Structure 1
Amino acid sequence: MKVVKEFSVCGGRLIKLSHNSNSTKTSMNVNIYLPKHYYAQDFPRNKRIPTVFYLSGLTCTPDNASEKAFWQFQADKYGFAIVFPDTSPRGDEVANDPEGSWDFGQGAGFYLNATQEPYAQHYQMYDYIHKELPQTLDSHFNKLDFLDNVAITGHSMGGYGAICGYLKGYSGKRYKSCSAFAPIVNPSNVPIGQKAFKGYLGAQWEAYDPCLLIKNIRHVGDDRILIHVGDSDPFLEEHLKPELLLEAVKATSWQDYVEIKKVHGFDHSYYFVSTFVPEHAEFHARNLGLI
């Protein structure tokens, strides 16, 4: 893992890293913010700094959310690290949308393990995020926990990947906390999701659809999914349709445990995301035992 660039921000440091990925077979870019706690003189030996993984939306790189969501202030506030993965494999060797669009191909992996050629070669974003990356960060830094006491969140395509990873890992307690911002919640039933699934996967889709996954996953204790979405989000009725997760949990053990806050006047933008980052941070902090 190479340090490409470091920025002091708040009391910690935002680090731009790269590494040769075994899942993607390409160089991958990742950012991590390390909180003030990591640089502090007295950090207790019987504590670990837990990690939040923030998954970005379509066309994004790690830098968009790093610059525009202000997680760094929350990170110092509660004592967690936050990791910002990229959104697809990238490179001259990596397949693109044959239609030359932005909703598929590069910047648009949909957090899936692709089975269809030519994408299967590089598009192993599910193993990348849940299997390789935490271990890679662990080998490089190890104060920090990338593997155990970990939260997952993200925006749009990323809230989708977040919810999806949380649910598929739920019996193993893979993630201790799950939130999302304007997620795509039922990919199988929405145009954007169907193109990603047809393209990357070619019945294989069910394993990647939160609305189908959640129904037979036995809810435990007080666990819940925090969602925010703006009612002025221009993608809301065609792509996101959050109401669909609500409907999916009716008469199900998850029924009272998916909280969608639909927030009047708000967008899809990082103006929206930055506004709800404080609440999501405190939600993740409590689930991580920081407060």
Structure 2
Amino acid sequence: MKVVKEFSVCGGRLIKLSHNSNSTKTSMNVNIYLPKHYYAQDKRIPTVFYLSGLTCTPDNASEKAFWQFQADKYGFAIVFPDTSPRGDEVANSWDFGQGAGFYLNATQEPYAQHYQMYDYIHKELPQTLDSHFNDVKLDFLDNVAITGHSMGGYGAICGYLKGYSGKRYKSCSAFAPIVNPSNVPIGQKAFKGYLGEEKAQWEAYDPCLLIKNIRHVGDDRILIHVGDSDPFLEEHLKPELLLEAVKATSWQDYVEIKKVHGFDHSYYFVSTFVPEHAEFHARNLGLI
């Protein structure tokens, strides 16, 4: 990969990266924060993958979530991927297209060409980062957490479940996730656009449908925060739907939704709860 820019933050560094992606057939932008532990003289640092919401680039969470303080405190690295392929040659209002790939492998043209964000996030990007950085000093593949906000919250829960039986991610949380995009207005527009009008091809990407037949094991838990003043809550987020979907299943008591008063959708909300989630992921990654 190519180092675009580095920033000193806390005891470590935020690095802006670009690389030519095979999944998307274009150049991609990725931010990573390396904690103070990476630069300490004289075992692998686990990683947290944070997926962003509609319209965001990697700079938004990097600047406004303050994960970096939490990364130094516990000893993890954190990766901020992009939300879609970008560029003049890529097909492209705020809720679909560029900045809005919904973490799916597109089948409909002209999106199919560049919109393979499911493969980009869970397959290509981790071992690309592994090639670049790795002595495995950093674990991108085995001991890894996934989290995110909104559409990113959706991507996180979706990736965790679809990989659960093979233990793909060892930890999962979300901030204001869209839990059931197949029957919600903002999720139907992306599904129709990328996957076509056949609703059966949607099913494989829908947390509420996927979770029912995944056998929960151990004390594994999904942590969700959502604010009661979130303007998207009633119409698009509908976190209730997932609590209903796990009723009478092995997952019933292991999806923890915390509805918090006064908080909205913003990074003021996110940054407030970053420390609690950081503690959550660090425990699961065996750091405390």
Same fold (TM over 0.5): yes
4+ long deviations beyond 2 Å = none
Q: CA deviation at 1:4?
A: 0.3
Tell me by how many angstroms 1:66 deviates.
0.1
* 1:59-102 Cα deviation digits (max 9, x unpaired): 00000000000000000000000000000000111111xxxx10
Partner of 1:152: 146
Rounded to whole Å, the distance in 1 between the matches of 2:222 and 2:201 is 24
Between the aligned partners of 1:260 and 1:26, the Cα distance in structure 2 is 37
Rounded to whole Å, the distance in 1 between the matches of 2:272 and 2:9 is 19
What is the distance in 1 between the residues matched to 2:203 and 2:280? 29
Structure 1 gap ranges (5+): none
> What's the C-alpha RMSD, in Å, of the aligned pairs?
0.4
* d(CA) in 2 for partners of 1:223, 1:204: 28
Deviation for aligned residue 1:146: 0.3
Q: CA deviation at 1:268?
A: 0.2
Distance 2:228 2:112 in 1: 36
> Could you tell me how far 1:210 is from its partner in structure 2?
0.2
In structure 1, C-alpha distance between the alignment counterparts of 2:91 and 2:228, rounded to whole Å: 35
SS at match of 2:279: helix
**2:130: which partner in 1?**
138
Superposed CA offset, 1:230-281 (max 9, x none): 0000000111001111000000110000000000100100000000000000
Aligned ranges 1:226-237 → 2 under 5 Å:
226-237=223-234
Offset of residue 179 of structure 1? 0.2
Q: Secondary structure at the match of 2:265?
A: coil
List runs of 5+ in structure 2 lacking aligned partners: none
- Within 2, Cα distance between the matches of 1:4 and 1:215? 43
Structure 1 position 167, deviation (Å): 0.2
Cα drift, residue 174 of structure 1: 0.2
Aligned to 1:170: 164
Shift of 1:284: 0.1
Q: TM-score, normalised by structure 1?
A: 0.97
Question: What are the superposed Cα offsets for residues 165-188 of structure 1, whole Å, 9 maximum, x if unpaired?
Answer: 000000000000000000000001
Deviation at 1:283, TM superposition (A): 0.2
Question: How far apart, in 2, do the equivalents of 1:74 and 1:244 lie?
Answer: 31
Q: So what's the TM-score if we normalise by structure 2?
A: 0.98
How many angstroms does 1:16 deviate by?
A: 0.2
2:73 to 70, 77, 98: 77
- CA deviation digits over 1:38-72, x for unaligned, max 9? 00012xxxx10000000000000000000000000
What CA deviation, in whole Å up to 9, does each residue of 1:100-147 have, x standing for no partner?
x10000000000000110000000000000000001000000010000
In structure 2, the residue matched to 1:238 is: 235
C-alpha distance in structure 1 between counterparts of 2:235 and 2:91, whole Å: 26
How high is the sequence identity, in percent, across the aligned residues?
100
Task: State the SS of the aligned residue for 1:261.
Answer: strand
The Cα shift of 1:7 comes to: 0.2
- Mapping for residues 1-291 of structure 1, pairs under 5 Å: 1-42=1-42, 47-96=43-92, 101-142=93-134, 143-202=137-196, 203-291=200-288
For 1:263 and 1:246, locate their aligned partners in 2 and report how far apart those are by CA, in whole Å.
16
Q: Distance in 1 between matches of 2:201 and 2:142?
A: 28
Superposition deviation, residue 13 in structure 1: 0.3
